[PDB]
Design a binder for these strands. Structure first.
Length: 54
RNA sequence: GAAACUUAAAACCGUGUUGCACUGCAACCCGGAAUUCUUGCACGUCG
């Protein structure tokens, strides 16, 4: 849902620890959202189009 | 006995349908098998 998508700014810190605000504002997400994907592996033998060690 | 053509003239001709009825017809799937698939971060760089 679009209720949680805040706008950030690209800040480039250096070895002295002094960031600068570039003009690169972009609609990002926010820390706290959970994204859940599904991964499916295929246990057919190798050279049949499978990967038992994946 | 020696001497005088049973000769002359005359179409085997005229008329007449190899014609009348009859389906190259009945029955028959251009049908059965086959993934527009395989790999690929809308990303990198900030006096």
């Amino acid at each position: 849902r679009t209720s949680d998508l805040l706008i950030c700014q690209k800040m480039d810190m250096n070895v002295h620890g002094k960031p600068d605000g570039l003009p690169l504002f972009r609609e990002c997400l926010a820390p706290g959202t959970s994204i859940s994907h599904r991964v499916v592996v295929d246990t057919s033998p190798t050279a049949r189009g499978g990967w038992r060690e994946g």
